[PDB]
């Protein structure tokens, strides 16, 4: 249906002379500093509810498909966490006793504080390596080096034990407490908007790349290949080439056992994925392969008779809480900070990926303070940092899992294993439990299948994804996320710097203006051209805007002006001796899609206006709605002759003005 | 004048069903790779003209106010360059003979290649310190250490001379040639758009701290204070505190002479600025103070009788061109690259500041290749890097100066001084020539008077300026520009992330839509609200867009939906036992100012559309002109029920549709 909107042509000064403005409220803080929460108890109840993210999902869960699913998922992820703790405790240069504590207590203190499902809090490989490195740096390997033991030639300088591991555990506990209090003080000032910068392609490249890292770190142990420690740049490539070079000393029995286990478990997993409708409850093959491996190992003695590799070092009993050493908290403060940061990073990553599979968008500051207080509670008990492994969350999400109660039942399993079931999982071959992680890693390995779809949608995000992936693979997960974030910001500033500028034109007998490079049968006003940059004119796209203008108008104002003055001097000297301009009347810049301007932008705009006025060709504008016009008039854009009359509300009004002017 | 534009309401599908598109030209390279310059000689002539920036201003200069002005400016800047060379050659751990060569030959080879006025090519303090550092690292201080000279107790291990300085000069020449060829290969691939990122506030904050740095580096020599070398972080502050701590061993005569000279020269400078109309030619007080200082020094013997400090080390005679050592070019390649980069940076800085005083905007790639070939020509002659000092360009621009011929006459003065006028400027006290730079530094010291103006114009550029200034002062000019560029990109992404969102509304009996938070006496459609985000919906402002929506509509869709389903379950269980929604009908997002979208953006937009559809409240759109709509339909935004009918061309069309629908 048509509509009659007959309205006189309204410029800027012709529109404000009859309307009225609104007095802007400065909102000074000297009297409004107590307007957040003075006496209203509703906001207090709300912030108390949001501070404790346990009364949200626990009073709302449904026990229909909950109990057995979360129980089996928790048992699986608890087995995985026990394996990871027994590995990382030895990797962290500390005695292998506190991995179970770091899998038990942080999970407990996170079950009450923290709203992020499908996350198993515990030790992470790269952060454990960083902890071990910063511990070895501030602690000599030989504390006393007792020279006794009647050696061969000189005094037997045996490495001192007992006190060495005790000091190492004390330093690790102090470091974890420092990282926790630093996470808490970071969550204090509410710096949580950083999560707004982690895009889905960014977290993908990252997760896939990590997947690959945890894949190779499980392959190096499923083959029993003695590899050196590598971190920083080229870490993954160096570990891979070291594995490929030292493939000789490989346990054949352990290798074939791991291969059989990964094959049978991926087969039963794809079978369950195919027959998910017949069998109601997903069969937990994790516990099945675990118990059959323990049975075939205890009944054959795969260690003392075949050298396959088993745990054989399960401790027992808890330890009382010990107070840390405050006098050292300064030294760790020099480095732990950085570690702490990347820790949180890894945390949100193992969330953000799953934010793409389930509508469970989380908040940054809440998870920040949750991980902070969780690592604080990890302190005083000689635990590890409150990170979260990728393999554990993978095995928790792939094998069912609905809420965080899976972590709770995993902690219960770890507790019963450390108090009464230690001798049960003694002959575990460390292979099927290192193969279930590779099995459930398929959910993240298949994430590379979206790159063909991402490229066919927007080549920007696909390039970002592949760049993040390769740069992480090269520079290690520590710097990979930072490099990917910098590249994403660079792509954003490039897309805001290089827009899709096109010349606009009206449709016949109407006032709709569309691009002429994509449509046909349009018409262009004789002597009046339209240009829509569709981008903020900041200090970057200034020369780009000039190039767009001089390419859309056909000519360049500088060259035609200098040629005109040269010809004027020529004809003047010829009279003293004796005797490429386009018919375009004006141009209307459709700079309506601009969101912000700077001082350089308005200066360049004034320079362009003056330069075009010097060629006797006017330059008009378009809908500077509310803020760009105020910022222009505030920066001294109107001084002596340039007024707001040259601007217009709509492009059709400018076209009609240029029409009725001639 | 009114206008009748009666037109039926046009949505997206209602506008493309009668018009036609244009076949997009893919422009494959396999057949268009020879379309740049195949046989047309016009483009060849143009690129030859642009490659040699000497046929532009030289056949165009006007000798009216040119000859004497550029002559005196060149003599002044040549004196300054001789002083800077005699200083930096000693600072670069090389014998003090080649500073005059680095001031003479690079200027010669830049006079023909390079279009950037008010720039004196030569040695720069920080790049000279970097050269000295990278030379001392790859060259031992004691080459042979001849143990002869019948010392006190052991053999007199005198430092080897002759070959030491020769090897140092050879290494410096090889380093300069390597930096030059690296600059050339950088200019090769035409990576010159980096100059598009250096804003005017950025270069101001860079040049004010550089002005303070050259001020303190001239103050440390005008007082004869033995200070240690400092580079990197806290360099300026450390040098300043070292000066303030070692102020004791200060030459009183030299101090009072420098003070008198700076006072009288600033007085005569402000007098000439006041009496510029009376005296046509600006009186070159530089040569006057120089000759009177040489007279009062040669007639009083200020060195051997007063210890004031003079040059007394002016060499004589040129040196034949010597071939470098190629077998070392690899080693310098590890570091020189970085240096080279920052060199170019400093270069463009001493241009960009003056780009604010004169309309002489330059191009990045041309200056890049010019400095490259200039430093290449500096090679084979044992010269320094082709940088440009701030004090030299300051004294060249403040004391007249029109074109680059000032550099040419400065080089001529340096040549005549090194061949025949060496004994003339022997007793120069190194004070008045170190005070003229502080005098002409006022032109850049007064550039801090824009902070209130920039603050009153736009709050962002002033914060950028002050941040760049303080960060440069803290971290040294090497990292200051990089930190300022990163902060500028961060401010850009923040301004594009946090827009000025406002609810829109129409004016009575018209179709103009303006913000309701700034105007009054407007009207809002009963049940229909307008929202204009005025920003690209990328992965950063997604949650910001959600917050804007739920704050403009008053409610939040998630909470009202969960409360509605809870109440539905409640009434259902009550029937089994026995028995805050705003009247807003729909919202029209005026997302017309969007310039680019990503996959996360379109995913979040689809999620918002579905969520609002679940609350029986429709959501409409606005002018997605040409590219955002195509990118949305390419990312799978329309699958089963969401069609392009919900979109509209103008906001008034959407309002009329919502009106006639009910």
UniProtKB/Swiss-Prot annotation, chains A, B:
Keywords: Cell membrane, Chloride, Membrane, Transmembrane, Transmembrane helix, Transport
Extracellular topological intervals: 92, 140-174, 223-246, 300-327, 389-404, 453-469
GO CC aspect terms: apical plasma membrane; brush border membrane; extracellular exosome; membrane
Xref: PROSITE patterns: SLC26A, STAS
Catalytic reaction equation(s): chloride(in) = chloride(out); iodide(out) = iodide(in); hydrogencarbonate(in) + chloride(out) = hydrogencarbonate(out) + chloride(in); iodide(in) + hydrogencarbonate(out) = iodide(out) + hydrogencarbonate(in)
Membrane topology, as annotated: Multi-pass membrane protein
Major localization listed first in the record, in broad terms: membrane
Intervals, Cytoplasmic compartment: 1-70, 114-118, 196-201, 268-278, 349-367, 426-431, 491-662
Domain of life: Eukaryota
GO biological process: one example: animal organ morphogenesis
Tissue: Highly expressed in the kidney (at protein level). Throughout the endolymphatic duct and sac, in distinct areas of the utricle and saccule, and in the external sulcus region within the cochlea. Expressed in the parotid gland.
Subcellular localization(s) per the UniProt record: Apical cell membrane; Cell membrane
Single GO MF descriptor: iodide transmembrane transporter activity
Transmembrane region(s): 71-91, 93-113, 119-139, 175-195, 202-222, 247-267, 279-299, 328-348, 368-388, 405-425, 432-452, 470-490
Domain spans labelled STAS: 518-658
Family: Belongs to the SLC26A/SulP transporter (TC 2.A.53) family.
Subunit note: Interacts with IQGAP1. This interaction enhances the chloride-bicarbonate exchange activity of SLC26A4.
PANTHER family assigned to the protein according to its UniProt record, in alphabetical order: SULFATE TRANSPORTER (PTHR11814)
Role this protein plays: Sodium-independent transporter of chloride and iodide. Mediates electroneutral iodide-chloride, iodide-bicarbonate and chloride-bicarbonate exchange with 1:1 stoichiometry. Mediates elctroneutral chloride-formate exchange.
Protein name (Swiss-Prot/TrEMBL): Pendrin
Species of origin: Mus musculus
């Amino acid at each position: 249906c048509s509509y009659t909107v007959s309205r006189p042509v309204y410029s800027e000064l012709a529109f404000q002379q009859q309307r009225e403005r609104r007095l802007p409220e400065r909102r000074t803080l000297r009297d409004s500093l107590a307007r957040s929460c003075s006496c209203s108890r509703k906001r207090a109840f709300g912030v108390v509810k949001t501070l404790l993210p346990i009364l949200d999902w626990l009073p709302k869960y449904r026990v229909k498909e909950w109990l057995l699913s979360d129980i089996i998922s928790g048992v699986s992820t608890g087995l995985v966490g026990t394996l990871q703790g027994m590995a990382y405790a030895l990797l962290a240069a500390v005695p292998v006793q506190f991995g179970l504590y770091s899998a038990f207590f942080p999970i407990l203190t996170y079950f009450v504080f923290g709203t992020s499902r499908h996350i198993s809090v515990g030790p992470f490989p790269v952060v454990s390596l960083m902890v071990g490195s910063v511990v070895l740096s501030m602690a000599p390997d030989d504390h006393f080096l007792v020279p006794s033991g009647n050696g061969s030639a000189l005094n037997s300088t045996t490495l001192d034990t007992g006190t060495r591991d005790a000091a190492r555990v004390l330093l690790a506990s102090t470091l974890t407490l420092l990282v926790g209090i630093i996470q808490l003080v970071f969550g204090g000032l509410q710096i949580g908007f950083i999560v707004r910068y982690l895009a889905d392609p960014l977290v993908g490249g990252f997760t896939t790349a990590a997947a690959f890292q945890v894949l190779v770190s499980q392959l190096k142990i499923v083959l029993n290949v003695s590899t050196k420690n590598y971190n920083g740049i080229l870490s993954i490539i160096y570990t891979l080439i070291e594995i490929f070079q030292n493939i000789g000393d490989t346990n054949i029995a352990d290798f074939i056992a791991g291969l059989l286990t990964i094959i049978v478990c991926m087969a039963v997993k794809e079978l369950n994925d195919r027959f998910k409708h017949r069998i109601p409850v997903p069969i937990p093959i994790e516990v099945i392969v675990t118990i059959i491996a323990t049975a075939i190992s205890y009944g054959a003695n795969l260690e003392k008779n075949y050298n396959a590799g088993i745990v054989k070092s399960i401790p027992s009993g808890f330890l009382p809480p010990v107070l840390p050493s405050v006098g050292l908290f300064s030294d760790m403060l020099a480095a732990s900070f950085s570690i702490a940061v990347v820790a949180y990073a890894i945390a949100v990553s193992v969330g953000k990926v799953y934010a793409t599979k389930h509508d469970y968008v989380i908040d940054g500051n809440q998870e920040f303070i949750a991980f902070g207080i969780s690592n604080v509670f990890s302190g005083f008990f000689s635990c590890f940092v409150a990170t979260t492994a990728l393999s554990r969350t993978a095995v928790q999400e792939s094998t069912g899992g609905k809420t965080q109660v899976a972590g709770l039942i995993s902690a219960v399993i770890v507790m019963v294993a450390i108090v009464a079931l230690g001798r049960l999982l003694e002959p575990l071959q460390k292979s099927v439990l290192a193969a279930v992680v590779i099995a459930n890693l398929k959910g993240m390995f298949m994430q590379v299948c979206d790159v063909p779809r991402l490229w066919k949608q927007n080549k920007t995000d696909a390039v970002i994804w592949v760049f993040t992936c390769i740069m992480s693979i090269i520079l290690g997960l520590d710097l990979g996320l930072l490099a990917g974030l910098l590249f994403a910001l660079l792509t954003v500033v490039l897309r805001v710097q290089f827009p899709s500028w096109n010349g606009l034109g009206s449709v016949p007998s109407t006032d709709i203006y569309k691009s002429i490079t994509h449509y046909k049968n349009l018409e262009e006003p004789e002597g009046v051209k339209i240009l829509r940059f569709s981008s903020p004119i900041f200090y970057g796209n200034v020369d780009g805007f000039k190039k767009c203008i001089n390419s859309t108008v056909g000519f360049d104002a500088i060259r035609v002006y200098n040629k005109r003055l040269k010809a004027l001097r020529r004809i003047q000297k010829l009279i003293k001796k004796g005797q490429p301009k386009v018919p375009i009347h004006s141009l209307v810049l459709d700079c309506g899609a601009v969101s912000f301007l700077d001082v350089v932008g308005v200066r360049s705009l004034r320079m362009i206006v003056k330069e075009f006025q010097r060629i006797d060709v006017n330059v008009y504008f378009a809908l500077l709605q509310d803020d760009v016009l105020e910022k222009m008039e505030q920066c001294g854009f109107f001084d002596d002759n340039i007024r707001k009359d040259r601007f217009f509300l709509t492009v059709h009004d400018a076209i009609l003005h240029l029409q009725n002017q001639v």
